[PDB]
Design a protein around this motif. Structure first.
Motif, PDB file in Angstrom:
ATOM      1  N   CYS A  68     -46.167 -12.946 -16.933  1.00  0.00           N
ATOM      2  CA  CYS A  68     -45.357 -13.991 -17.588  1.00  0.00           C
ATOM      3  C   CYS A  68     -46.252 -14.797 -18.569  1.00  0.00           C
ATOM      4  O   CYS A  68     -45.778 -15.163 -19.662  1.00  0.00           O
ATOM      5  N   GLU A 101     -36.795 -15.322 -20.212  1.00  0.00           N
ATOM      6  CA  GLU A 101     -36.843 -16.409 -19.221  1.00  0.00           C
ATOM      7  C   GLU A 101     -35.673 -16.269 -18.258  1.00  0.00           C
ATOM      8  O   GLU A 101     -35.809 -16.518 -17.051  1.00  0.00           O
ATOM      9  N   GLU A 102     -34.504 -15.927 -18.792  1.00  0.00           N
ATOM     10  CA  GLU A 102     -33.289 -15.758 -17.937  1.00  0.00           C
ATOM     11  C   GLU A 102     -33.529 -14.693 -16.873  1.00  0.00           C
ATOM     12  O   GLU A 102     -33.114 -14.869 -15.700  1.00  0.00           O
ATOM     13  N   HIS A 103     -34.255 -13.631 -17.185  1.00  0.00           N
ATOM     14  CA  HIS A 103     -34.445 -12.458 -16.295  1.00  0.00           C
ATOM     15  C   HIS A 103     -35.701 -12.582 -15.418  1.00  0.00           C
ATOM     16  O   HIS A 103     -35.667 -12.093 -14.272  1.00  0.00           O
ATOM     17  N   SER A 105     -37.024 -15.369 -14.062  1.00  0.00           N
ATOM     18  CA  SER A 105     -36.877 -16.457 -13.061  1.00  0.00           C
ATOM     19  C   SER A 105     -36.736 -15.879 -11.634  1.00  0.00           C
ATOM     20  O   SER A 105     -37.501 -16.317 -10.735  1.00  0.00           O
ATOM     21  N   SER A 106     -35.857 -14.901 -11.428  1.00  0.00           N
ATOM     22  CA  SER A 106     -35.614 -14.326 -10.071  1.00  0.00           C
ATOM     23  C   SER A 106     -36.847 -13.513  -9.615  1.00  0.00           C
ATOM     24  O   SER A 106     -37.160 -13.504  -8.419  1.00  0.00           O
ATOM     25  N   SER A 109     -39.416 -16.150  -8.453  1.00  0.00           N
ATOM     26  CA  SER A 109     -38.922 -16.775  -7.198  1.00  0.00           C
ATOM     27  C   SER A 109     -39.078 -15.807  -6.016  1.00  0.00           C
ATOM     28  O   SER A 109     -39.563 -16.253  -4.949  1.00  0.00           O
TER      29      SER A 109
END
Ligand SMILES: CC(C)NC(=O)N1CCN(C(=O)c2cccs2)CC1
Length: 121
Positions: A68, A101-103, A105-106, A109
């Motif tokens: 990232c 960023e949308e993809h 994140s999970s 986490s």
């Protein structure tokens, strides 16, 4: 979902999606100095998606946080080199960043959750 290794294939799949995006075109290979001879006066650390994919496939990322950081460097390099916030290639960078960023994140986490579970006892 406590698989400590699952991030790597999730990152490979996300990079395949980014390569299918027309907005990744400027970022698929290292910037060419012949076109941009001043680039290394502005950009200390060039980065591109082919370098990210090779680093992942070589087994040279320990975590999805490191991947990232390198993908975010692609986008900060573009923001630094653009003469206008209304530039074609910069505007492509901003749509691709929102998609990434949308993809991611999970992926981040789930990884951090898996590591906390590994150290629970
Ligand atoms: C691989 C090749 C297609 N890349 C390339 O030459 N780029 C894309 C990255 N870059 C930029 O981010 C900007 C250009 C102008 C505004 S930003 C410099 C030019």
């Amino acid at each position: 979902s406590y698989d400590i290794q699952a991030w790597k294939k999730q990152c490979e799949e996300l990079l395949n999606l980014i390569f299918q995006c027309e907005d990744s075109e400027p970022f698929r290979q290292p910037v060419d100095l012949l076109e941009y001879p001043d680039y290394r006066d502005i950009i200390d650390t060039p980065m591109d998606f082919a370098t990210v994919r090779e680093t992942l496939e070589a087994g040279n990322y320990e975590s999805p946080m490191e991947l990232c950081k390198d993908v975010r460097l692609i986008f900060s390099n573009s923001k630094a080199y653009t003469p206008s916030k209304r530039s074609r290639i910069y505007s492509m960078s901003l749509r691709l960043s929102a998609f990434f960023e949308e993809h991611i994140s999970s992926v981040l986490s789930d990884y951090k959750s898996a590591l906390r579970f590994h150290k629970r006892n």
